[PDB]
Design a protein around this ligand. Sequence first.
Ligand SMILES: CC1(C)CCC(C)(C)c2cc([C@H](O)C(=O)Nc3ccc(C(=O)O)cc3F)ccc21
Length: 237
Amino acid sequence: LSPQLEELITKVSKAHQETFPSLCQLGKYTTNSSADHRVQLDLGLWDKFSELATKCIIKIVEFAKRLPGFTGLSIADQITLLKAACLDILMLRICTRYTPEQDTMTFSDGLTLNRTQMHNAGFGPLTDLVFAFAGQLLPLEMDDTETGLLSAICLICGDRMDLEEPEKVDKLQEPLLEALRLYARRRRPSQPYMFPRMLMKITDLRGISTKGAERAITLKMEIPGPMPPLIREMLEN
Ligand SMILES: CC1(C)CCC(C)(C)c2cc([C@H](O)C(=O)Nc3ccc(C(=O)O)cc3F)ccc21
């Protein structure tokens, strides 16, 4: 029935808005750490960054638990899905927080870092790609509910590796794909290419993620002391 899809659109949307505050509703603030020029790594900036990344991972898990059906999956699958799609969601999240005019990216507590600071915070040689990915996301003018659905689709993925019940995860994903097409087309009937442009983004996203995992390999050498435990859980993929 249609009322069940509208119900799913509503739940996913609320689940996202509650685990991911919008840019416009955020109390933006700045820091003066290494804003001047690019350096290998500003450690004070990386502590605050890892701290925020860990908080986001928890918010991602929180969001995943509110997605209809996820909890019914085996606990092994739930972990497997999160493990595989966490960086992807993480990348999509910070990218929806791009303010093109100031050329900054805002975090959930309001920390607003300019490109130089993002670089010095840990992004390193991947900074510019991330920023270019966020740029090219702007033209799609997605909203909170579309980002939420898109994020769910990245998560509920049957093609993952150690799934015990891949066939069940595929069925869970089915309505999210219907839900997103129904929603995207209704909001904007004049641009029928939004849905397929959104799905194709999942591929782009997945790519900026493998580069991000790759960047975490290097970073581990540059930082004094082990990377946070939840961040490490995610990278063990
Ligand atoms: C694996 C690890 C720790 C090292 C490699 C790089 C620097 C590439 C990276 C990049 C990201 C991600 O792109 C991001 O910043 N997401 C992000 C999104 C939202 C918030 C928030 O709203 O608070 C915080 C974030 F952290 C996350 C992890 C990592």
